[PDB]
Amino acid sequence: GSHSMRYFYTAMSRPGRGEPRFIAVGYVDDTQFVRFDSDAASPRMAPRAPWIEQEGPEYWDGETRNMKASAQTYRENLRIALRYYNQSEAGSHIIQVMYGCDVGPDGRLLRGHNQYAYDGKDYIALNEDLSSWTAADTAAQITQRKWEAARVAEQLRAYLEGLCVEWLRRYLENGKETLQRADPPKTHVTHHPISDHEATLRCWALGFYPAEITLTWQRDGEDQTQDTELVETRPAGDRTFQKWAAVVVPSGEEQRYTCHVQHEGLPKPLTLRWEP
Amino acid sequence: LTVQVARVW
Amino acid sequence: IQRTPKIQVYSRHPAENGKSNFLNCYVSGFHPSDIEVDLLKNGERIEKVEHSDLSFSKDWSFYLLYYTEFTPTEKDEYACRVNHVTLSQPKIVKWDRDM
């Protein structure tokens, strides 16, 4: 169905311990496919998925050149941010970047993204029109003024509507075996007494891709959102993801509880109960 | 493919 | 403003004694990015532990997966030890085969 390409940059200063570290990673959907780390013995854009390995040396040299250039720019931006926020040169600070494109089944641009953070807070973001900016504070407004003057938005629009979509489509075809395969969750319900009158029902989802999933408990057909313990979806390490949802139920009332599982890999939503 | 130039703040 | 890490300790595949597996420690939701993560076997640091490349969620908080090959037994206890600037003392989360 729909797909996304995302790049994530992290630039972290470390006064007294050398120049700021720059790490870049690239994703198609929930699959990482490239990385760059300025702290590597030999910094370069490197493959992290099998289907990207077929890209030639001009790809890898070009991307490596770009990441080294980007690293230098974001080291500059870290110095600039200190000024904008009247901060001392003694502290460690972080700039983060996430950008990319979303496409529909036909591979047409759904929307683009280009957003920035400073010390974990929104800094500036390209609006959905890909032509204007939202600045989070008066510091970012300075950046906005600079970027409006230099017409940065137009250049980002050109990338997001062009190369981003084009290369995402290329990656999707080259990695169709995996990127265009949904693995449905393997599911089951576990039961563990807490006491003489209460028990935990835990609904498990395992081995699924992509990460997007909905696990819900119902009691007598009504959602138990507030009484459900829901862990964050977590990576298994083999491309797939895991998740569970638990509720505490009165003993003898277990069969009034149903777990409901929604996932792209499933032809229809699943309903599961504990099976003693 | 990454965007080709980073912007100065 | 800083964010303390969430911690999950778990296996890649359903655990069965004698069968080779992967022990995972997933740390997420934290900021800044500096974090110290150990995988413990019976209280002692496992040497060959790899981790994923630093990335982050839509709310800018970071996540990392630390992992190592291991073969679960009935005797052996495993845990994940995490330190972060938000933590005055390292936080230990024990591996629970049902979690």
Residue numbers in the entry:
A (entry chain A): 1 to 276
B (entry chain C): 1 to 9
C (entry chain B): 1 to 99
Text lifted from the article:
HLA-B*58:01 had the most shallow C and D pockets and B*57:03 the shallowest E and F pockets. In contrast, Arg and Lys were unable to be accommodated in the E pocket of HLA-B*57:03. Instead, due to the reduced E pocket volume caused by the Ser116Tyr substitution, these residues deviated by 9.7 Å and pointed out of the groove. The deviation at PΩ-2 was concomitant with a 5.3 Å shift and 180° rotation of the PΩ-3 residue to fill the C-pocket of HLA-B*57:03. Structural analysis of bound peptide conformation showed a pronounced change in orientation of PΩ-2 Arg/Lys conferred by the Ser116Tyr polymorphism of HLA-B*57:03 that would markedly change the surface presented to T cells. In contrast, PΩ-2 Arg negatively impacted the stability of HLA-B*57:03 and HLA-B*58:01 complexes. In contrast, the substitution of the P9Tyr for Trp, which is more enriched at this location in ligands of both allotypes, improved the stability of both HLA-B*57:01 (+2.8 °C) and HLA-B*57:03 (+8.6 °C) complexes. Despite this, HLA-B*57:03, like HLA-B*57:01 and HLA-B*58:01, was more stable when in complex with peptides containing the bulky PΩTrp (compared to PΩTyr or Phe).
